[PDB]
């Protein structure tokens, strides 16, 4: 289907984007950032950055990503301005342990299923939190989920002094169709388009034809995993 669907390869993309755009932080694939621990770890992560601004050698150790070392996580914290979070929704589910036991072996079944990657990009330079979903409305409605992120946005405004954060719907035009498992790949493609231009509109970057759109995405996926094919280790990047 597409090899930008595994958490490991989505992490490799996040590293690829920190190599091409140094202001973005890579993602942590070790805490379950499903709808349950969705906004808690954003507030947590963005706080341990503002605690990074003052001299700090203690909070970095506990809120560290496991794949990272806490000195490196503090250096990447202090210098980053763009923070992506990939969230895993299933519309058949509403408890963390069952959405999780579901994963615990959804990894050893290893088939994917009704899954769906979503993307939020928290950028402290714009004081903006964009939401993107390849199927737009598939994880929540577009103006409840927006509240949820207008709810997160004001909490962020409180720990990051210049006023609440801006909210932009990334997903306006439906870009996926049926039986396509390319939602990690569209999350990647939106992150690359965002990091090149945060005020892009995706409707001019997506062809209005559907098959031209799928051909563009498969060209992107091939270019991307060619750029990523030498990323071996999983650790967070050194530079």
């Amino acid at each position: 289907p597409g090899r930008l669907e595994d958490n490991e390869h989505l992490f490799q993309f996040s590293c690829l984007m920190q190599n091409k755009h140094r202001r973005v932080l890579p993602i942590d694939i070790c805490n379950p950032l499903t709808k349950f621990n969705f906004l808690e770890c954003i507030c947590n992560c963005l706080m341990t950055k503002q605690s990074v601004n003052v001299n700090e050698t203690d909070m970095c150790e506990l809120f560290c990503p496991p794949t990272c070392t806490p000195e490196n996580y503090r250096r990447l914290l202090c210098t980053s301005s763009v923070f992506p979070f990939v969230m895993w929704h299933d519309p058949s589910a509403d408890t963390q342990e069952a959405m999780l036991t579901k994963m615990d072996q959804t990894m050893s079944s290893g088939r994917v299923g009704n899954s769906h990657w979503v993307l939020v990009i928290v950028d402290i330079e714009y004081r903006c939190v964009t939401f993107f979903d390849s199927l737009c409305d598939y994880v929540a409605s577009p103006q409840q989920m927006r509240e949820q992120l207008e709810g997160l946005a004001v909490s962020l405004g409180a720990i990051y002094p210049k006023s609440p954060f801006q909210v932009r719907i990334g997903s306006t035009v439906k870009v996926q169709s049926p039986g396509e498992f390319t939602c990690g790949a569209w999350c990647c493609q939106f992150l690359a388009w965002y990091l090149e231009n945060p005020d892009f509109d995706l409707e001019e970057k997506v062809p209005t034809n559907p098959s031209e759109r799928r051909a563009l995405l498969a060209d992107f996926i091939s270019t991307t995993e060619q750029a990523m094919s030498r990323y071996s280790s999983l650790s967070w990047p050194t530079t």
Binding site: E5, D6, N7, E8, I29, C30, N31, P32, P66, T67, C68, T69, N72, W88, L100, T101, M103, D104, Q105, T106, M107, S108, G110, R111, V112, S115, H116, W117, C183, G184, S233, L234, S235, W236
Partner: protein
């Protein structure tokens, strides 16, 4: 001695080891407790990848060192 291997799922796993059990030995028993062999995962300790080949003694994995384990989660 006990060590622990917290993962991508939080279902922390309690596993008794020895100071020089190997990485595929530990991966032999997480396949003996959840059924996933020593090629499908990757152990991580202190931001450093555990090489299939080595053994606890090399990394100072003392009693209860929180270890961590990356799966392959498809979404």
């Amino acid at each position: 001695m006990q060590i622990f291997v917290k993962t991508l799922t939080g279902k922390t796993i309690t596993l008794e080891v020895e100071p020089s059990d190997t990485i595929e030995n530990v991966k032999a028993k997480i396949q003996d407790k959840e059924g996933i062999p020593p090629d499908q995962q990757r152990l991580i300790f202190a931001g450093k990848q555990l090489e299939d080949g080595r053994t606890l003694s090399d990394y100072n994995i003392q009693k209860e060192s929180t270890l961590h384990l990356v799966l392959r989660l498809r979404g």
